[PDB]
Each structure stands twice: as structure tokens, then as C-alpha cells.
Design brief:
part of a larger assembly; 4 chains; A mainly alpha; B mainly alpha; C mainly alpha; D mainly alpha; A: mainly alpha; 3 helices; 0% strand; D: mainly alpha; binds 1,2-Distearoyl-sn-glycerophosphoethanolamine; binds eicosane; cell inner membrane (chain A); translocase (chain A); transmembrane (chain A)
Chain lengths: 100, 54, 480, 504
């Protein structure tokens, strides 16, 4: 009764919202937050695709996606803690000296 | 009129073009992570539009 | 399908690398011994190579709905394992200079080798996604292993953020493809489309998002800007492992995906990949023109060489020798980048600390270390495509595959980018034999030295005499 | 079974020249002389036992010697060597030039001289290899593998008075020109092999089987154009000549690298053996363009030579003009012009070798190459200005030297084919006399224009003088008796000419 198209469009909306939140923010924490939004949107799209076909594979890919999201959130917050404890500044544009 | 080898200079023109193009392309490697994410999204837009056109 | 005992006899490198991970981890939990844990890592990787020989005694079979093991998979597994072994060998003097925990580096290197093996045997979207994450996140750890170093922390943050974004793009594309196809197997990606309806927009857009993620992973233009910063900031053995193992494993699974997907011979994806290959070759060669840093220069070089690989990939279904060309090119590129980043590793070893500069200064290298200058020159000529080297054999293979498939724009791009490459590679080599104005004693440094000399001897011998490697790659056919 | 050894002897000689560096610094020059004399004597033996004066043109392919061993059997690639009269003349020429190069790089007492000898023999063995190979991939391999040694001994061993950046720039320019053109030739070779595989089913790189390749006119034109661009960089043909004067000027100041690498033109041989037999129709359509490029090369090289203040750049531009003559000769389709082109190639090699050796000796005597800094050198040197006068007279085209025989036989055949181009080229000979007399008047005649030209310069060493006199004697013998050379090259020249004119 629910269209697959509507669930896919909802996942796409959340994905592009996470992408623009990733781009527009100088603070690294909001960049990590936008990354979490994008990966949650991708997992939602996999759930919609799996539930449309009546298959278990969508929830399995969802489980793999949230395992990835947990590990990436852990690593990114470790890197953010390192940046804050070595520079006392979460500005990502200051971490830019390698260029050319 | 032909003491400085004009044909040699005209054949050396592609080296000048290559140096100018490389110097222009190296400006996009500014080191900003936000621009790197922006360029990834721009390339995603270009790839998706090209695939939808064909 | 389920698991048989013979399926376990078609799984040994994965189990060997996983058991090496567990054993090294428990040995770290026992005590913090750099020598013993590094040795356990290299014995585990060597045993995985011997396990590859043992499964070469066995046949080719589909071990899961996920995995498929054939000679294609064994060839790419061997390339990944050789890259990992070289990385550990270069990492030991570097980690000897590193005044913190050292064996976590080996644990992450082994875990990334496990992900490379998974990508080498992947026949399924779930396995491809998992292998990509399994080579990516240990590289998050390894690129910023020296997180107190400001350049390494910068490279870690850049690679972590950008690879998380690319993983999101790839996952979204896989979800859209599964929404269309209804099956995550590679062979079913386009099976439910017939009568010329192969160009369905949802399948194409899903493949486009996967192309964005994979081309980030392959440093393809315009997902390439991370490459010089991440290459320069990362530790030099980590740069070696990234440039060799990650790109080889991801391009192998990309080769398999475009081989068994029925949507692989759509004209739209072929044209988009042709544009990406053209731009990658030209942009990498042009951007490496005025580089005084060897690591950034090798990043741009990696961009151009993956463009050549993409040119070989485009001629898959039209031609026949495309996968053989990819194998020969991957062997030559593996040995060349191994030697190049190996010299970068040993001249940057031991690790001098987070505050000291890691600048290379290759100018005048012959007058204080002649043999490493010779090996750097040999690999510079190999990446240029000089006929006395196996890099030319790969260039000749991709040129033959572009001529056979009549890809004349890509052939001209190969020639022009080759000329620009000649300029910057020969500048690097003649700088090695210049005069420097002004400016070890273990056996693991000698092990890294003999590794780069062995790679040079292999690339020179297979440049003059390429037939053994050609016959090695040719027998590695997959289950068609 | 001497052609595999004809390529292997320079390689092993250079390798052992590098190896014997531990035994001394004065040692590897003797090993270099030994291996170059061995190669020259083996080539002379194969000439004397060849019987080229008594063989008739029996249709391409026709070789005196042949050898085949499978190198890359997956691609059907083999080490396939062969020799006939023209190829043997070329290999004897590079053997003699390599002997002269070794004798010219004498008393170079310095560290890493063994590597200089190793690079020299790699270049010479490579030139022999491209002169002998009849497998297309093998020919291209040999074509492109002189490039690394030539690049390294230009950039590292070059003209030491100039800045190291200038030598590196000249070496990189030469490498980029020749290797890009070689890659274009590789593309043409691959396309030809694939076309033969599609039209027949047999996959090969053998030249004798690729001759009978049915193809359209445009595809044949494109393959010919790739081959021609590869040969036109190395010929040199304008405007692809620009690498040559800087490569000569930034060559090592002994004057041996010019003889070893440049002063034998493998491009004319490549055109004769591959551009005309494989693509005869395309060469026939391309002939007016190549002829007018040759005329432009003649006059542009003459005007360029007159404008120089450097002697070495002047001689390089004389080489450009003479090769314009040869390029006109090759596309005539005339047997007389082909034989004249062979004589002109040999005479240009000898005369330019003499000119470059004399210029190197003059530079070691006066420590400058600027013609505004000298004059009146006839009263200061004992042998150099008169030998330079002879060699400027020779490259001027004077009868009694082989340059006249080659040039005028080219012009006789060309006037039988193309009269107007012949007329313009003879006025190019007037231009040649003009620049030769200009160089003689600027260098050796008049009053001293500086302080270094006002002193009694040291005399000539006996080895340098004797090999210059050997070049003089060979040039005079070529001018007065060119018949053995014509009888040697007649069968190969006639076979190429008959294949070219019976296919159109
Ligand atoms: C007649 C037409 C038909 C036949 C065409 C045949 C094509 C192949 C043969 C001709 C090739 C011509 C190449 C011309 C440039 C040669 C290289 C050169 O001159 O390099 C010197 C220059 C460095 O000089 P420098 O001042 O030291 O640099 C600043 C830093 N110090 O270097 C630089 O500035 C950078 C050099 C970059 C690499 C060289 C340029 C490559 C461009 C593509 C070449 C492929 C052919 C493209 C079409 C050519 C025209 C038809
Ligand atoms: C910038 C530096 C590099 C130089 C440029 C890069 C290479 C450019 C090559 C352009 C080729 C254009 C071909 C146009 C038609 C393609 C499609 C087609 O219809 O092909 C025809 C034909 C295949 O049809 P088939 O019947 O199977 O072949 C039998 C042939 N009788 O096709 C064939 O048979 C194959 C035809 C191959 C043609 C020769 C390719 C190489 C030519 C030499 C190099 C390019 C020209 C010189 C350099 C330019 C300036 C740098
Ligand atoms: C940054 C620097 C680099 C980038 C900028 C520089 C430019 C780079 C690219 C340069 C090369 C461009 C492409 C050249 C090849 C074009 C091929 C082509 O259009 O082929 C069409 C046609 C194919 O043959 P076709 O007639 O289809 O055969 C089947 C039935 N007969 O062909 C024919 O029928 C024959 C066509 C012959 C003429 C076309 C080739 C011209 C080559 C010009 C250079 C060489 C000129 C001669 C030598 C000069 C002195 C060295
Ligand atoms: C029309 C029908 C009749 C045709 C035949 C009769 C007319 C032609 C007669 C031409 C006579 C030219 C005489 C030139 C003698 C120059 C001698 C000389 O010393 O010149 C000065 C200079 C010397 O060089 P350098 O050593 O550097 O000295 C320092 C520079 N002052 O050297 C120079 O500056 C070089 C001077 C070069 C002169 C070149 C002459 C070419 C003649 C071509 C004739 C073509 C006839 C047909 C023309 C086309 C008709 C359609
Ligand atoms: C009904 C009685 C069955 C007895 C035997 C039961 C077990 C047989 C099959 C064993 C399969 C083991 C699979 C292990 C996979 C490990 C993968 C590790 C990856 C790193
Ligand atoms: C096919 C490979 C070609 C390049 C090989 C490079 C290594 C060769 C062995 C080392 C040679 C070093 C020579 C240094 C000479 C320096 C001379 C300086 C004064 C002119
Ligand atoms: C900035 C660098 C640009 C390099 C461009 C290199 C171009 C090389 C020449 C390509 C020629 C392609 C010709 C294609 C003809 C196709 C004809 C099809 C007929 C059916």
C-alpha cells in the first residue's frame, strides 16, 4: 500500500540534506553529523528496497550499514577529539596547509 | 628574421600550454576539505546528469 | 547456497588472515613486543600466500551467494598479500622510530589485507560494500597512526571524512540498484531488463553513485583532490599500502562487477567512464608537472595510472584481452609503486617524531645512497612506460586494448599524458643524479632495501622478458 | 648466425666496460675500443662474405641473413633479425662511427667513465638493433631504447660550460620529441597488426606477413602518417627539427655522443624499409608533401646555419638541410635517386662526423664556440683550419667528395621525376656554399676578434688527426669511387623501388 518510490524519495531527501550539512559547516562536529545523516539515509533506502521485494536482504544490508555507521562515528569522534586537544579549535578550514 | 628559429618556438608552444594548464589545475588543490567534499558532490552531479542524458 | 567442507577448502586466505589478526591481537594482549608481533603478521601473510597455492591446487567455486573464488580471485589476492607484506616490511623501521604503540599498525594492516581479499573474491553487492569498508577504516587508523603529527592528522581527517561521504554515496547507489533489480548478486544487475531496456534510469543512477564512491577510491577525476594531501600526510608505508593494495583490490572488484553485470555493456556508463579516464590521465599528468614533493607527485601519477586502467576497463565487453591487460598492468603498477613508495619509506625511516619535517629531498640521492637512486630511477622509468620496464608492457597492453576497441580518444590521451609523464618522471630521475648542496645499520632496513631491489629486478626482467607474467595472468580466467 | 651477436657484442662490451671500472680509469677505453673494433670487423667480414655485388632483386622479402626466435609468443612477437645490402651498409656505418666515438672520447680520465662507455655502447647496439630488426614490435623496442642512455649522457655528461638546467632542458626536449613520436609509431604498428588479424585470422608481428594487408586508403594513410611522424622527428624534418641543435650543443664536449647517437639517420632507413613497402599507395599520395617539406628543410636549414654564431648549431642546421635533400630523394620512386640517397646518407655521416670532431677540438683549444670571438685562426693552428676547410668544402657539395655523388645523383633521379623541386634544391646547393664560406670566413679568416684568437694554439693529437684523415680518405674514395657502395645497396634498393612502383 506504500509506494517504493515514496520511500526512495524520502531517503534521497535525507541524503542530500546530510550532504549539504556536510558541505556548509566549518565545524568538524557538524560534518560528522551530516555524514551520519547520509549513511542513515542510505540504510533507510536499503530497508525500503528490501521491504518492497519481501526479502530479508534489505534488513541485512541495514545491519551492515549501521555497523559501518557505528565504526565511522567512533573513528570520526576520536579524530575530532584529537583535533580539539591539539589545536583547541574545531575549524576545519584551519587544517589546510597541505596544498599545491 | 630567422636567427631565433621560429618553427622551433611554434613547436615549443604546446610545452607552454601544458605549463599554463598545469598551473591552472593546481589551484584546485588548495587543501580545503570542504572544497574537496564540494568537488565530490559536483562530480556526482556531473556523473548523474551525464548518465541521465544518455 | 550453504557451506560444504570443500567450500572451506575454497576459503583459506580469508581464514588465515583472520586467525593472524586474532593471534597478533592476543599476543599484544600478552605483551607489547614490536618484533614478535611484526613477525607474526608477516608469517600470517606468507601463510596466506601458501594457502593461495593450496587453493590453486583446488578448483573454482561459488563460496556463498557472496563469494566466488577462481584464478582471477587468486591473482588479485596474491597482489594484495604482496602489497601487505611489503607494507609491513617498510613499516618496521618506521615504527621502530615511532615512540608509541606499534603493533596496532600491524593489526590494522592485516585487517585491511582481509578486506582486500574479500574484494578480490567478491561476487555480490554486500561483499563489495563490506570489503570496501574493511580496506577503508583500517586506512583511517593507518593514515593517522601518527596523529600527533599535524600533517598526518590532516590527512587522517581528510581521508576519513571523504571516505565516509563516498561510502554513503556507494551505499545509496547499491540501495537504488537493489530497488530496481531485486537481487544483490552481480549477475542479476540488469537481468530483469530485456528487449533493449538496459538503460533504465534507476539502475544507471545507482551505478552512478557507486561510480562516485569507487572513483573516489580509485582517485579518478573529479574525485581525485584528496590524493596528494592524503598521500603526503600519511606515513610512507601507509602511502605504499594505500596506493598499491587499495586501488588494486577496488579495481579488481570493479572489473568483476562490470564483467558479470548485464548493465555493464550499456553505452551511457561506457561514455561516462571514458570521460573520467580521459580527464584522469590528462589532469594527473598535467598536475604532476611542477611538483617538488615526491609523494604528491606520486599521487598525481596514481591518478593517471588509474586512468590508464580505466581505459583498459572500458574495452571489456567489446574486446577479449581486456582482463589480461588489467592483470599485466596491475602487476607492473604494483611492483613500480611498491618500489617507489618503498624508497620514500626507507629514506623517511626511522620516524623522526611529530615535530620534525618528513621532507624527502631526492636531489643528489646517488651521492649518498647509489642503489636506492638506481631503483628510484628504474621505477620512474617504469611509471613513464619506457620499453625496458614492465610499465611499458602494461602501457602496450592497454594501447592494444584501446586500438582493438577503437577507443582513439583514449589512445591519444594515453600518448599525450605519457609525454607529460616523461617530462616530470625524467625530471625526478635526473634530479636524483644531480648534486645535493647539504644534508640504518639494522637488518629490517636491509629487508626493505632487498624488497625494492627485488621489485626493480622483477620490473626490469619482465620488461625485457614479459612472457612468464603474461602466461601467469592468462591462466587466471574466472567462471564465465 | 652473426646478427644476434651483432647486437649482443656492443651490449656485453658496454656491460664489461662498466664492470672493469674497478681495475682502473684508463682501462675501460681499451675495452670500448676492443668491442667497437670487434663489431666493425664482424660487419666487415659479413660484407666481404656477403656477395652483394652479384645478387639480383628477386622480390621483397629478400635477405642475405635471417634469424627468428620466439620472444613473446602470446602476441606472436619474436626476435626476428635480417640483413641485406642497405642494412649492412648502415650497420658498417654505425660500427665505424662507434669506433670514431670511442677514439674521440679518449683521455677522459674521470670517475664513472665506465658508465659513459656503457651508455655509448647501449646507444650503438640499439642503432644496430633497429637497423637489423624485421619484427615490428622488436623494431619499435630497439627504436625507443636508445632514449634512456642518450638522455642520461646529454643531461649528466653534456656541455659542462653551460648550466646544468640547459643540458637537462635539451635532453628532456629530445626525449619528449622522440618518445612521443615513437608512441605514435607504436599505435600505427598495433593498428596494422589488428587489421591483418581481422582481415585474415592470423595474428603476427612479422614484417614479411604484414606486407600483404588489404586495407582502405584512409587507414593506410593514417598508418603511414604515424610511421612518418616517428621518422620525421628523427630525420629531422621541419618543423620537428628543433630538438637537434640544442641536443648537439648540449652534447658532451668531446664530440662523441653526436657520432654515436645522432650522426647516423635510422629514419631514412625506416622510411625506405617500412614506409614504402608496407604503405606504398599512401606514400605515393604523400610524396608531394614530403618533397616540399624537404625543400623547406633545405632552405630553412641553410638560413638557420648562416645566422648562427655557434659552430655546432651551424653544423646541426647543415645536417637539417642535407636531410631535406634525402627526404626529397626517398619519395621519388627512382632507383637512381634511391642510390643517391644511400650515398648521401653515408657521406653525410662521414662529413658531419669530421665537422663535429673538428669543432670539438677547436672548442678544447679556444674554450669558446662563439664565432664573433675569433678570426685569423689559420695562422694560429697547424692542422685544424685546413681540415675544417676540407670538410666545409665537402658539405658544400664539392665533386671529389662523396657528398657531391650523393647529392647530384639524388638530383639526377629527382629531375627525372620532379624537375621544379630539383631546380629549387640546386639553388639550395648555392645556399650551402654560402653558409660554408661564411663559417670559414668567421672562424679561420680575417683578423683576431679577441685575445684567445691572438695566441698560438696547441697542435693536434695524432689519434684525433689520424681518424680525421681516415674520414677524409673515406670521403675522397666515396667521391671518386662509389661503385662498391652502389653494388652493395643495389639489390635492396631495387627490391624496395620495384615493390613501391608495382603496387601503385
Ligand atoms: C608537426 C605536427 C605533426 C606531428 C606531431 C608530433 C608530436 C610529437 C613530436 C613533437 C613533440 C613536441 C614537444 C614540444 C615540447 C618539448 C618539451 C620541452 O620543450 O620541454 C621543456 C620545458 C621545460 O623548460 P624549463 O624552462 O626548464 O621549465 C620551467 C621550469 N624550469 O618543458 C615544459 O615547459 C613542460 C613540458 C611538458 C611535456 C611536453 C609537452 C607535451 C605536449 C603533448 C605532446 C604530444 C603531441 C601533441 C600535439 C603536438 C602538435 C601537433
Ligand atoms: C596526439 C598523439 C597521438 C596521435 C593521435 C591518436 C591516434 C588517432 C587515431 C585516429 C583513428 C581514426 C579512425 C577513424 C575511424 C574509426 C572507426 C572506423 O570506421 O574504423 C575503420 C576501421 C575498422 O573497420 P574494419 O573494416 O574492421 O577495418 C579493416 C580496415 N580496412 O578501423 C581500422 O581498421 C583501424 C584504423 C586505425 C588507423 C590508424 C591509427 C593510428 C594512426 C597514426 C596516429 C594518428 C595520426 C598521426 C598523429 C597525429 C598528430 C599527433
Ligand atoms: C596539449 C597538446 C595536445 C592536445 C592538442 C593538440 C591536438 C592533439 C590531437 C592531434 C590529432 C588529431 C586527430 C588526427 C587523426 C584524425 C583521424 C581521422 O579523422 O580519420 C578520418 C579518416 C579515416 O579513414 P577513412 O576514410 O574513414 O577510412 C575508411 C574508408 N577509406 O582519415 C582519412 O581518411 C585520412 C585523413 C588524413 C589526415 C588527418 C590526419 C592529419 C595529421 C596532421 C599531422 C601530420 C601532418 C603530416 C606530417 C607533417 C610533418 C611531420
Ligand atoms: C635573373 C637571371 C640571372 C640570374 C643570375 C644572375 C643574378 C644572380 C647573381 C647573384 C650574385 C650574388 C653575389 C653575393 C656575394 C656575397 C659575398 C659576400 O661576402 O657577402 C657578404 C656575406 C659574407 O658572409 P660572412 O662571412 O658572414 O661575412 C660577414 C658579413 N658581411 O655573405 C652574404 O651576405 C651572403 C650573400 C648570399 C647571396 C646569395 C645569392 C643567390 C643567387 C641566386 C640566383 C637565382 C637566380 C634566379 C632567381 C629567381 C628568378 C625567378
Ligand atoms: C548436523 C551435524 C553437522 C556437524 C558439522 C557442523 C559444522 C560444519 C560446517 C562448518 C562451517 C564453518 C564455517 C566457518 C566460517 C569462518 C569464516 C571466517 C572469516 C574470517
Ligand atoms: C634501464 C635502466 C637505465 C637507468 C639505470 C640507472 C642506474 C644505473 C647504475 C648507476 C649509474 C650511476 C651513474 C652516475 C654518473 C654520474 C656522473 C657525474 C659526472 C658527470
Ligand atoms: C588536453 C589534451 C587533449 C588530448 C587529445 C588527444 C586526441 C587524439 C586524437 C583523437 C582522434 C579521435 C578520432 C575519432 C574518429 C572516430 C570516427 C568514427 C567513425 C564511425
Amino acid at each position: 500500500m506504500i509506494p517504493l518510490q515514496h520511500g526512495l524519495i524520502l531517503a534521497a531527501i535525507l541524503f542530500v540534506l546530510g550532504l549539504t550539512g556536510l558541505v556548509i559547516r566549518r565545524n568538524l562536529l557538524f560534518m560528522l553529523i551530516g555524514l551520519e545523516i547520509m549513511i542513515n539515509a542510505s540504510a533507510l533506502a536499503f530497508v525500503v528496497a528490501g521491504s518492497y521485494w519481501g526479502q530479508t536482504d534489505g534488513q541485512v544490508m541495514y545491519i551492515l550499514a549501521i555497523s559501518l555507521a557505528a565504526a565511522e562515528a567512533s573513528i570520526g569522534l576520536a579524530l575530532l577529539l584529537q583535533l580539539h586537544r591539539r589545536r583547541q579549535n574545531l575549524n576545519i578550514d584551519s587544517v589546510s596547509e597541505m596544498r599545491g | 628574421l630567422l636567427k631565433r628559429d621560429p618553427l622551433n618556438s611554434m613547436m615549443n608552444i604546446p610545452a607552454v600550454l601544458s605549463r599554463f594548464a598545469g598551473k591552472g589545475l593546481l589551484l584546485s588543490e588548495n587543501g580545503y576539505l570542504r572544497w574537496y567534499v564540494a568537488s565530490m558532490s559536483i562530480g556526482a552531479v556531473v556523473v548523474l546528469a551525464l548518465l541521465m542524458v544518455l | 547456497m550453504t557451506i560444504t567442507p570443500q567450500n572451506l577448502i575454497a576459503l583459506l586466505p580469508l581464514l588465515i588472515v583472520g586467525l593472524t589478526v586474532v593471534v597478533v591481537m592476543l599476543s599484544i594482549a600478552w605483551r607489547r613486543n614490536h618484533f614478535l608481533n611484526a613477525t607474526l603478521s608477516v608469517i600470517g601473510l606468507n601463510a596466506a600466500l601458501v594457502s593461495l597455492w593450496f587453493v590453486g591446487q583446488a578448483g573454482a567455486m561459488d563460496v556463498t551467494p557472496l563469494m566466488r573464488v577462481d584464478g582471477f580471485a587468486m591473482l588479485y589476492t596474491g597482489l594484495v598479500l604482496l602489497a601487505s607484506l611489503a607494507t609491513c616490511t617498510f613499516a618496521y623501521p618506521w615504527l621502530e622510530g615511532y615512540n608509541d604503540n606499534k603493533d596496532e599498525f600491524y593489526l590494522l594492516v592485516l585487517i585491511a589485507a582481509l578486506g582486500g581479499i574479500l574484494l578480490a573474491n567478491a561476487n555480490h553487492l554486500a561483499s563489495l560494500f563490506l570489503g570496501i569498508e574493511l580496506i577503508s577504516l583500517p586506512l583511517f587508523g593507518l593514515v593517522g597512526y601518527a596523529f600527533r603529527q599535524k600533517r598526518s592528522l590532516e590527512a587522517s581527517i581528510k581521508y576519513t571524512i571523504l571516505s565516509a561521504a563516498a561510502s554513503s554515496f556507494l551505499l545509496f547507489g547499491m540501495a537504488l540498484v537493489y530497488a530496481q533489480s531485486g537481487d544483490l548478486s552481480f549477475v542479476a544487475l540488469g537481468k530483469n531488463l530485456g528487449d533493449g531496456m538496459l538503460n533504465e534510469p534507476l539502475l544507471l543512477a545507482g551505478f552512478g553513485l557507486m561510480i562516485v564512491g569507487l572513483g573516489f577510491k580509485l582517485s579518478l577525476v573529479p574525485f581525485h583532490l584528496w590524493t596528494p594531501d592524503v598521500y603526503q600526510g600519511a606515513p610512507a608505508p601507509v602511502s605504499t599500502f594505500l596506493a598499491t593494495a587499495s586501488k588494486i583490490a577496488i579495481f579488481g572488484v570493479v572489473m568483476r562487477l562490470f564483467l558479470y553485470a548485464p548493465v555493464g555493456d550499456s553505452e551511457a556508463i561506457r561514455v561516462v567512464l571514458a570521460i573520467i579516464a580521459f580527464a584522469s590521465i590528462i589532469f594527473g599528468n598535467l598536475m604532476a608537472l611542477s611538483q617538488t614533493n615526491i609523494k604528491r607527485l606520486l599521487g598525481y601519477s596514481s591518478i593517471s595510472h588509474l586512468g590508464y586502467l580505466l581505459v583498459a576497463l572500458i574495452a571489456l565487453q567489446t574486446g577479449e584481452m581486456s582482463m589480461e591487460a588489467v592483470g599485466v598492468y596491475l602487476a607492473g603498477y604494483l611492483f613500480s609503486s611498491l618500489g617507489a613508495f618503498g624508497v620514500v619509506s626507507l629514506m623517511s625511516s626511522p620516524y623522526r617524531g611529530p615535530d620534525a619535517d618528513s621532507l624527502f629531498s631526492y636531489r643528489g640521492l646517488f651521492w649518498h645512497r647509489p642503489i636506492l637512486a638506481a631503483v628510484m630511477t628504474v621505477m620512474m622509468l617504469s611509471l613513464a612506460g619506457i620499453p625496458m620496464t614492465l610499465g611499458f608492457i602494461g602501457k602496450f597492453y592497454v594501447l592494444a586494448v584501446g586500438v582493438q576497441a577503437h577507443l582513439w580518444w583514449l589512445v591519444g590521451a594515453v600518448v599525450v599524458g605519457s609525454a607529460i609523464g616523461l617530462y616530470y618522471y625524467l625530471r625526478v630521475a635526473v634530479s636524483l643524479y644531480l648534486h645535493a648542496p647539504e644534508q640504518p645499520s639494522n637488518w629490517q632496513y636491509s629487508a626493505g632495501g632487498i624488497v625494492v631491489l627485488i621489485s626493480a629486478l622483477l620490473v626490469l626482467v619482465l620488461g625485457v622478458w614479459p612472457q612468464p607474467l603474461i602466461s601467469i595472468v592468462r591462466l587466471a580466467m574466472p567462471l564465465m | 648466425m652473426l646478427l644476434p651477436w651483432l647486437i649482443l657484442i656492443p651490449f656485453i662490451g658496454g656491460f664489461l666496460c662498466w664492470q672493469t671500472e674497478r681495475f682502473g680509469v684508463k682501462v675501460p677505453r681499451w675495452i670500448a675500443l676492443i668491442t667497437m673494433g670487434l663489431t666493425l670487423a664482424l660487419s666487415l667480414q659479413l660484407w666481404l662474405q656477403g656477395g652483394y655485388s652479384l645478387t639480383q632483386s628477386a622480390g621483397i622479402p629478400q635477405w642475405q641473413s635471417e634469424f627468428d626466435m620466439p620472444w613473446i609468443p602470446r602476441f606472436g612477437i619474436s626476435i626476428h633479425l635480417a640483413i641485406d645490402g642497405l642494412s649492412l651498409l648502415m650497420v658498417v656505418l654505425t660500427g665505424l662511427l662507434g669506433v670514431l666515438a670511442v677514439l674521440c672520447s679518449w683521455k677522459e680520465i674521470e670517475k664513472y667513465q665506465g658508465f659513459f662507455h656503457l651508455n655509448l655502447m647501449w646507444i650503438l647496439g640499439g642503432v644496430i638493433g633497429v637497423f637489423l630488426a624485421i619484427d615490428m614490435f622488436l623494431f619499435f623496442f630497439f627504436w625507443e631504447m636508445m632514449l634512456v642512455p642518450m638522455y642520461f649522457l646529454i643531461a649528466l655528461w653534456g656541455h659542462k660550460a653551460s648550466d646544468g638546467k640547459t643540458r637537462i632542458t635539451a635532453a628532456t626536449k629530445f626525449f619528449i620529441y622522440t618518445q612521443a613520436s615513437g608512441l605514435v609509431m607504436l599505435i600505427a604498428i598495433l593498428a596494422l597488426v589488428f587489421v591483418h588479424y581481422n582481415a585474415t585470422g592470423v595474428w603476427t608481428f612479422n614484417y614479411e606477413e604484414l606486407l600483404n594487408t588489404p586495407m582502405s586508403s584512409g587507414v593506410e594513410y593514417l598508418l603511414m602518417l604515424g610511421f612518418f611522424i616517428a621518422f620525421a622527428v628523427k630525420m629531422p624534418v621541419v618543423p620537428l627539427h628543433g630538438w637537434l641543435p640544442d641536443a648537439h650543443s648540449q652534447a658532451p664536449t668531446a664530440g662523441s655522443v653526436d657520432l654515436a647517437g645522432i650522426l647516423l639517420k635510422t629514419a631514412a632507413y625506416g622510411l625506405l624499409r617500412f614506409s614504402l613497402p608496407l604503405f606504398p599507395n599512401a606514400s605515393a599520395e604523400f610524396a608531394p608533401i614530403a618533397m616540399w617539406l624537404g625543400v623547406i628543410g633545405i632552405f630553412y636549414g641553410a638560413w638557420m646555419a648562416f645566422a648562427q654564431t655557434d659552430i655546432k648549431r651551424l653544423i646541426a642546421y647543415t645536417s637539417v638541410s642535407h636531410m631535406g635533400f634525402v627526404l626529397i630523394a626517398i619519395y621519388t620512386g627512382s632507383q637512381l635517386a634511391y642510390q643517391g640517397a644511400v650515398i648521401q646518407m653515408i657521406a653525410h655521416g662521414l662529413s658531419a662526423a669530421g665537422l663535429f670532431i673538428l669543432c670539438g677540438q677547436l672548442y678544447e683549444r679556444i674554450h669558446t664556440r662563439d664565432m664573433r670571438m675569433m678570426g685569423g685562426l689559420w695562422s694560429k693552428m697547424k692542422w685544424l683550419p685546413a681540415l675544417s676547410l676540407f670538410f666545409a668544402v665537402a658539405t658544400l657539395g664539392m665533386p671529389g667528395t662523396g657528398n657531391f655523388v650523393g647529392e647530384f645523383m639524388i638530383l639526377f633521379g629527382s629531375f627525372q621525376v620532379v624537375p621544379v623541386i630539383t631546380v629549387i634544391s640546386t639553388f639550395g646547393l648555392v645556399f650551402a656554399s654560402v653558409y660554408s664560406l661564411a663559417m670559414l670566413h668567421r672562424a679561420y679568416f680575417g683578423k683576431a676578434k679577441s685575445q684567445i684568437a691572438s695566441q698560438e694554439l696547441p697542435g693536434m693529437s695524432l689519434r684525433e688527426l689520424f681518424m680525421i684523415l681516415l674520414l677524409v680518405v673515406l670521403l675522397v674514395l666515396l667521391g671518386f669511387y662509389p661503385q662498391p657502395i652502389l653494388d652493395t645497396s643495389h639489390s635492396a634498393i631495387g627490391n624496395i623501388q620495384q615493390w613501391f612502383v608495382n603496387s601503385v
